[PDB]
């Protein structure tokens, strides 16, 4: 007669989750844990409540110099990160070059807020013409204009007296100071604008020892101009002073930027705009809201983020081989 039985067995279910191993692919298991995030909301969002600075069609240079097409950014609140397009159309409206531009952007990676302040008022230039430094290459509302944060100085009564000016950083914070020099087309323009044939711009701080000379050359017209503007920056430390001397070709400071808040930031290249959302993890393609430890959205992220991998699939077996 049939004896009593006891049997040992294991669980099977209707699961179709599959994992891979060294020796075998597409093993159906009873339980698995996907650990790879693959979705994003495709939007640029706030980072833990803090809105980003989205520069739209302006570049970093256009923002900090005061491109008149960039009046949206005359005073921007604290940002979490900065978003710049690949080729912003509002950059140096008057053609030229920004000196040590990449190093400056690198400093921007460590800054969350600027307070723009006036260091040299536009009116205090008594020996020089301050309201004539306008061009049609920097138009505003159909009229010629210029970078709003710097002053293009011009000769007065066919004379250009030696400029000797100094600013003392009384603020308790570091100061970003911007200026520039004008490289004209030929000697006729040099005399036309600054009278003096040979000119220079000496700039000095506790550490800086600069002396710029306008280089003359016949160049291609860029945005309708063959002259050039070469811009410069420095970080004036608290209780330090900057000294300018020049007998022409001087793009003087007017506004300088007080670095009120340092912290973690980044410059993000993306063609997207603001999405009116909030996230703790942001990529240039979109924001991530995920508990999984890995993601494959984009390597450049900011915030509290999963770790990026180039994988299309990361799935851990937790249960056992599921029999059909």
């Amino acid at each position: 007669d049939p004896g009593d039985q006891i049997c040992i067995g294991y669980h099977a279910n209707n699961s179709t989750e599959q994992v891979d191993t060294i020796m075998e692919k597409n093993v159906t298991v009873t339980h698995a844990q996907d650990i790879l995030e693959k979705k994003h909301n495709g939007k640029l969002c706030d980072l833990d409540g803090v809105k980003p600075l989205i520069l739209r069609d302006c570049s970093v240079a256009g923002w900090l110099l005061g491109n008149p097409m960039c009046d949206e950014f005359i005073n921007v609140p604290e940002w979490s990160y900065i978003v710049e397009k690949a080729n912003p159309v509002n950059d140096l409206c008057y053609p030229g070059d920004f000196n040590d531009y990449e190093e400056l952007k690198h400093l921007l990676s460590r800054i969350n807020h600027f307070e723009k302040i006036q260091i040299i008022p536009k009116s205090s230039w008594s020996s020089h013409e301050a309201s004539l430094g306008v061009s049609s290459a920097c138009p505003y509302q159909g009229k010629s204009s210029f970078f709003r944060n710097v002053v293009w100085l011009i000769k007065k009564n066919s004379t250009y007296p030696t400029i000797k000016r100094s600013y003392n950083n009384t603020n308790q914070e570091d100061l970003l100071v911007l200026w520039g020099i004008h490289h004209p087309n030929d000697a006729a323009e040099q005399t036309k604008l600054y009278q003096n044939p040979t000119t220079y711009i000496s700039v000095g701080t506790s550490t800086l020892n600069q002396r710029l000379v306008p280089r003359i050359a016949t160049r291609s017209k860029v945005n309708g101009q063959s002259g050039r503007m070469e811009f410069f920056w420095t970080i004036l430390k608290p209780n330090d002073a900057i000294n300018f001397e020049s007998n022409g070709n001087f793009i003087a400071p007017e506004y300088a930027y007080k670095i009120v808040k340092k912290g973690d930031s980044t410059i993000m290249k993306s063609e997207l705009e603001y999405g009116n959302c909030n996230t703790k993890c942001q990529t240039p393609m979109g924001a991530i809201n995920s508990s999984m430890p890995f993601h494959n959205i984009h390597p450049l992220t900011i915030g509290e983020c999963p770790k990026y991998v180039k994988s299309n699939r990361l799935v851990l077996a937790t249960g056992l081989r599921n029999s059909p």
Binding site: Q5, C7, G9, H11, V27, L300, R321
Partner: protein, 176 residues
């Protein structure tokens, strides 16, 4: 599997055992049913939980790519920056993918081992008081009621209590 139990000498799984990974099916005069073995199941849950957390925590300190910009005459260092960052991303992708493949193999074999060991636990309890049918089941040479089944499940089977009755059944069978 490495250990020959899962999809091995135990040919398939039990759709009817829903509360655990491993367990028992019993059949006696009082009826029949499934019982998950809670101890081995719990050890397995602890093991796999530790494995998943260990995988996540070892991947904690991996490379974070940073945006860097270079001008038109810094092409050598831009390229260096690119191969450096891509190099680390390739390294960490390899580590993640490989660790998952290897650990998945080990997890499947771990379950297989646990089933084999549960089987051997019963077999070494019962000894010649039961017949090994070769498919994960034992046929008792004596009556084994629900208290006896429970004693086998929870590791307290009393071989001497039944050895006489079983010996009598064995001798009866081996005599024809």
């Amino acid at each position: 599997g490495l250990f020959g139990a899962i999809a091995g000498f135990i040919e398939g799984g039990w759709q009817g055992m829903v509360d655990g990974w491993y367990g028992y099916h019993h059949s006696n005069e009082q009826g029949s049913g499934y019982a998950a073995d809670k101890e081995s199941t719990q050890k397995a849950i602890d093991g796999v939980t530790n494995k998943v957390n260990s995988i996540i925590d070892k991947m904690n300190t991996q490379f974070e790519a940073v945006g860097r910009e270079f001008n038109n005459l810094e092409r050598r260092i831009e390229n260096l920056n690119k191969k450096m960052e891509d190099g680390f991303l390739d390294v960490w992708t390899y580590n993640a993918e490989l660790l998952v493949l290897m650990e998945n193999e080990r997890t499947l074999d771990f379950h297989d081992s646990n089933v084999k060991n549960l089987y051997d636990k019963v077999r070494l309890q019962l000894r010649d008081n039961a017949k090994e049918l070769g498919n994960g089941c034992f046929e008792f040479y004596h009556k084994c009621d629900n208290e006896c089944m429970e004693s086998v499940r929870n590791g307290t089977y009393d071989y001497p209590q039944y050895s006489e009755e079983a010996r009598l059944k064995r001798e009866e069978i081996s005599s024809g």
